Nucleic acid binder design. Sequence first.
DNA 1: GAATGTGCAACAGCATGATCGCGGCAAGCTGCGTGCAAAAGTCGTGCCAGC
RNA 2: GCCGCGA
Lengths: 98, 147, 241, 46, 49, 74, 50
Amino acid sequence: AKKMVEREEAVVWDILDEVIREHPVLLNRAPTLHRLGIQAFEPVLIEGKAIQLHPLVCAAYNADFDGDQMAVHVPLTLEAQLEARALMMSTNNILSPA
Amino acid sequence: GHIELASPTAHIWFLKSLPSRIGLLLDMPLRDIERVLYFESYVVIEGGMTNLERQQILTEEQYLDALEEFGDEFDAKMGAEAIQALLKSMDLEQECEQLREELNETNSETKRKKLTKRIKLLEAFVQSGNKPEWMILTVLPVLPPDL
Amino acid sequence: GGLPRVADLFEARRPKEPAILAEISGIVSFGKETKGKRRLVITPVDGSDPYEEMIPKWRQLNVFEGERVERGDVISDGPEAPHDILRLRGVHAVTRYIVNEVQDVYRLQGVKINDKHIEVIVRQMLRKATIVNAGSSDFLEGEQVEYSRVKIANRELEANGKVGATYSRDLLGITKASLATESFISAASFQETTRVLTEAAVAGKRDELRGLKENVIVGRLIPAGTGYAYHQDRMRRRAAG
Amino acid sequence: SCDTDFGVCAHCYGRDLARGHIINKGEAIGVIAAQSIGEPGTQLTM
Amino acid sequence: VKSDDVNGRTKMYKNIVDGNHQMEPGMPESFNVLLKEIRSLGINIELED
Amino acid sequence: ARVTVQDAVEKIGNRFDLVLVAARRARQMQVGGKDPLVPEENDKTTVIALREIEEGLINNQILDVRERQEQQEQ
Amino acid sequence: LLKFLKAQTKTEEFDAIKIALASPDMIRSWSFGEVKKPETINYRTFKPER
DNA sequence: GAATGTGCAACAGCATGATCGCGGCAAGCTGCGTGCAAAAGTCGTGCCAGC
RNA sequence: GCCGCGA
Ligand SMILES: [Mg+2]
Ligand SMILES: [Zn+2]
């Protein structure tokens, strides 16, 4: 499995798509000021190297597309996945807690 | 692991701080204790027969004068060993009772804060199971190598 | 002005010119043996126990007559410290003053912040009450208001209700009320660690890992959110032995 | 004035500003309040 | 389980390869290091039961 | 797939206990010895448990009585 | 004298971290031995000291 | 009318001053010596066993 | 550790 992942065959990409399907991943920007600076998202695989961020959440992130970078963390636990889906999702926090 | 110092040394943690534990526990100022800790002045202990006090801060010249006059009955050491001896010789309970008696007998806003701080530290020491002689250490622990 | 004042308000720093206040009955007395030390020693009889105050005469006195000056009235004009408001006007007044004053900074710059968040932090500044009575193993010391309230309730429940000791509530800054927590693992990870460790070492105290920072340092579930359910079940097991 | 010991009552604290419902037990309100107050300041004109 | 659990990391990796998604947490090595540093001074710190 | 979990929130209202209930149900359906009570749409066990909670046939009480029933059976 | 686990059993249940002064006896109890030489590693054998 | 403490103001020392990333250098190399027993290891030498 | 740089 390790060798065939290193070789990156097509079925490896298919299995990666299968795994990604509904596993939330949480993105955060560097100066996390309030709790809305780290939010969970459903990932969609893109053929590139830059994270594509939904514009409506940018005001929450204080993020603009002039060279900003963001970090990605995988909640690799069932409880962590539920917490990301039920507490961290962008659709969950619409009204700011201020 | 550990290393034996073969001579008591003073913990820099407690001696050098604005609310110095040993400093306000011995009712002596930080200048005098930091002064005896580097052998530049002597502290005599006991000496009830002689006129020397329990916490005298006599210097070297006074030490030779006492040796010429008092001779025996004068017990003074220069290093942290004297501090350890006078820390061990203290009776915590009777000192706390005397401090409480003085505090309730005489009321003064200036000495009240000092008396309350001293009695609080003494009560903490007696109730916590600690011993003041442990403040200055004779054996020094060392960190594990992999750290 | 500006906003190095949100820090100043939360630090509970006394201003350069405090405005002193009075007691229940501020009868006019002008001076009484003022002499060299200060001047205009006001001696309001107030029926009994007159409250002697000293004024350095560099500040004018506003209320010349008696006028039945009530407690908390401004005897001399000036910016009042939040400490005096707590002592004389009450717990609610110091929250109203802090909230209104800190909202002035935010509202001027067009920032919307709910009043609850400011009041929540003020609650954390209103601990460590001082006892002015005795009988219940408390006497002229700084003690947690939660502990004092719990002990009083137990004493009041029993027949000996007079054992309950009256207390005086204090107001501390955020930098000072943080270091005054009863747990040493926290408040040593925030400010001067040398000072906190020495006091914790001599006292022989315990942390008990009740807050968020302690459990984060150790790595257990924090007692909030999803971890609140786990921490509650553990507490019953300890209580039941 | 929650009068409760080691925490705040869910009624003395109003509805959480994130959602229309009342705040539920186990919500770390102190961190939220501190973050809410301290998120500005970077834009306060000193 | 992500940073400082020497056995927790391996247990998590084994569970994920198996497909369990179970936590099985432990004791971070950073706090043990901190305890060793504090004990290396004249201060005694310990964990009660 | 469930974009929002408001229905699960309103089925049993804490936004915190539902995480625990769904984690328990997902463990039951993932480690084995359990089958979903709602048609499986090739999605992961997390959203299957969440949809079971939302449709009202999974909660704390019935999970406990199921634990008791399978305990008494063996 | 086999089938023994120490890493797993090293995770013992605990609560209420306690801090106090360290007595010399307790310090010696922590210590597994005594260090007497300032040197650390000898270059003649690339091995630690005695 | 001279004497004795309490309040007090200037003063010296301690503690703190946002977060997360990226790329390059320059180092940082640390301390005997001693003569002898006592031991261990080594080298020149002779041995038997296999082809 | 310095030096420069990005939000
Ligand atoms: Mg930008
Ligand atoms: Zn309440």
